[PDB]
Design a protein around this ligand. Structure first.
Ligand SMILES: c1ccn(CCOc2ccc3[nH]ccc3c2)c1
Ligand SMILES: [Yb+3]
Ligand SMILES: [Zn+2]
Length: 606
């Protein structure tokens, strides 16, 4: 049961294919066109079915060349409105028909952000991008908006001729639009069956540069050269991922670097990963995000969570593979360092939510819960900790990687639950079932709070970070003079970040200590977004008014929710900046991403 979807479930009917024919209207901020769904009955005598929609205007529904009856039910909040379609002839089991729906989206579509020219790099043209995960595809087109259903798709997208459209699919040509010579039609094909949350579209002034045998980077012209360098490890990571996961089946692996309001670090859209431009550190230091998105090409896009209650299957396994890729590139001690950092992020989330909160369970129950509200580090890092614990229990990384590749092979092109995963784990490790029975499954999978057992972590790269954090924390005023730029001499950017993460866990520190830290380390000069984020949080939580305009600037000049949400919350919690924090949100909200605007407003109680 997919409690996030109002559509007929997969046991009743299933979409096999979507043919999308649409036009992007920047004057009206609407997409208008037809969604032709090829649907296969799973029941005898099927006479109706229901699709998910959200803020869509339906013009008509056509089957066998005739208009048919349909009805839109009452809106159910963030789930949207169910659309019931009256089939003209009762279908037998396995029979397939094509249902062609004429629709138009709303400018407030929660799947979409429409940007004016001023919100782009080039300042001449507008830009549109989508983000369907988890349940926003219904705000673009009517569909069974559940990851329990997989479908292929084709699309034809008409756009102003000076712009470029891309989708999560192989590019299948471009022509002038016969209905309007001021336009171009871009065509697409996704021959591999996917869940509809992986449908993606961007329209803008995009240019491309090849950076590997199967990878172009796409962005506005101003970002191309920098993106090419930043993500140059992409091919080497794909080769390692193929070694761990089996064949890459999607053809191309292209990258799209979005404008700064993109809400996530990345989105694993097939053939075309979307990334934040906050990855552009200049030194490739945030490339774990690329490794993560690459890994989703197996865990998530091939083996998929059957409902969003089982999101940890997607995310936990992906973090596990991510950390292996980075460990192959940079060493097993670095994999452990990153693993242990992730446990720290899990501590933070559990402390933030509260150790008994339902969203700290590994498997969650999203009945009446908006996935965007529930979203956190938990499925990522509690899922990873479980897998890392199991790795250690069952004989080490070589052995557990054998399981992972067998698991991907077994469930490719399928959608699964936590029970499916656990059943297969027991089947694969049939000779170690004694050891598996030692795991407290009920606590790991279903209980809130920190896991019942913490894995073992190599400390080599972490010790210097803890040591320095502890010096600052225990320092008194007469110790502040001993600190100096040389303290950071032998620390990588990853280690500087972890030093800040350790210190932030003990915040506030005294204002004088934070002033000294800027004096000796000049953190204000660091443009690395992960570093700058934690530094500004530490400054604001420690009540440094000088940091207020810096934090406001970072919160608004980009929109990755990982950074924007906690910066606004911190600024709201500081009495000196509270009124400005809400004013700034109020002023910006109309031009923010619709999901980000929603969540920041809830965070700020405005
Ligand atoms: C990374 C890139 C896009 N997203 C969208 C958020 O999606 C989800 C999906 C599934 C979820 N289960 C619980 C919260 C939750 C949130 C997260
Ligand atoms: Yb002293
Ligand atoms: Zn992910």
């Amino acid at each position: 049961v997919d409690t996030c979807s109002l559509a007929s479930p997969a046991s009743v009917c299933r979409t096999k294919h979507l043919h999308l024919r649409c036009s992007v209207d920047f004057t009206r901020r609407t997409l208008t066109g037809t969604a032709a769904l090829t649907v296969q009955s799973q029941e005898d005598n099927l006479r109706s079915l229901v699709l998910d929609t959200k803020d869509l205007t339906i013009e008509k529904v056509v089957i066998n060349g005739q208009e048919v009856k349909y009805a839109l039910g009452e809106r159910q909040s963030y789930k949207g409105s169910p659309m019931e379609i009256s089939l003209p002839i009762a279908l037998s089991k396995n029979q397939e028909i094509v249902i062609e729906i004429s629709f138009e989206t709303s400018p407030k579509s929660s799947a979409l952000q429409w940007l004016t020219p001023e919100q782009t790099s080039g300042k001449e043209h507008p830009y549109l991008f989508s983000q369907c995960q988890a349940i926003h595809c219904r705000a673009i087109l009517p569909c069974q908006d559940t990851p329990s259903v997989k479908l292929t798709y084709t699309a034809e997208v008409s756009v102003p001729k000076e712009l470029v459209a891309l989708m999560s699919a192989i590019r299948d040509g471009e022509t002038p639009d016969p209905e309007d010579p001021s336009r171009k039609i871009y065509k697409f094909i996704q021959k591999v069956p996917i869940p509809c949350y992986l449908i993606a579209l961007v329209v803008g002034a995009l240019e491309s540069r090849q950076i590997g045998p199967r990878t172009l980077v796409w962005s506005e012209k101003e970002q191309v050269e920098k993106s090419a360098y930043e993500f140059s490890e992409t091919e080497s990571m794909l080769k390692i991922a193929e070694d761990l996961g089996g064949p890459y089946v999607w053809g191309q692996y292209d990258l799209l670097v979005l404008p700064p309001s993109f809400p996530y670090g990345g989105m694993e859209n097939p053939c075309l990963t979307f990334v934040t431009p906050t990855l552009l550190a200049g030194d490739k230091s945030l490339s774990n995000v690329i490794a993560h998105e690459i890994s989703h090409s197996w865990t998530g896009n091939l083996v998929t969570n059957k409902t969003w209650d089982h999101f940890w299957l997607n995310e936990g396994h992906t973090v596990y593979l991510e950390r292996h890729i980075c460990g192959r590139l940079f060493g097993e001690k670095f994999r452990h360092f990153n693993a242990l950092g992730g446990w720290g992020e899990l501590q933070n989330s559990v402390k933030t939510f509260g150790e008994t909160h339902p969203f700290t369970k590994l498997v969650v129950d999203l009945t009446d819960i908006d996935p965007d509200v529930a979203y956190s580090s938990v499925p990522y890092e509690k899922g990873f900790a479980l897998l890392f614990y199991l790795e250690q229990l069952l004989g080490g990384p070589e052995i557990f990687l054998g399981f992972l590749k067998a698991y991907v092979e077994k469930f490719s092109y399928k959608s699964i639950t936590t029970d499916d995963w656990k059943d297969f784990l027991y089947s694969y490790f049939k000779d170690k079932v004694d050891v598996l029975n030692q795991v407290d499954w009920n606590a790991w999978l279903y209980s809130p709070g920190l896991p019942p057992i913490k894995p073992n972590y190599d400390m080599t790269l972490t010790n210097a970070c803890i040591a320095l954090s502890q010096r600052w924390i225990t320092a008194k005023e007469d110790d502040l003079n001993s600190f100096n730029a040389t303290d950071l001499k032998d620390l990588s950017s990853h280690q500087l970040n972890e030093f800040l993460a350790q210190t932030l866990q003990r915040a506030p520190l005294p204002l004088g200590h934070i002033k000294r830290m800027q004096e000796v380390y000049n953190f204000n000069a660091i443009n690395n977004s992960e570093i700058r984020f934690r530094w500004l949080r530490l400054c604001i939580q420690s009540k440094w008014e000088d940091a207020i305009p810096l934090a406001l600037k970072m919160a608004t000049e980009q929109g990755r929710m990982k950074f924007t949400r906690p910066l606004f919350k911190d600024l709201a919690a500081f009495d000196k900046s509270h009124d400005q924090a809400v004013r700034t949100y109020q002023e910006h909200k109309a031009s923010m991403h619709p999901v980000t605007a929603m969540l920041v407003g809830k965070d700020l109680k405005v």
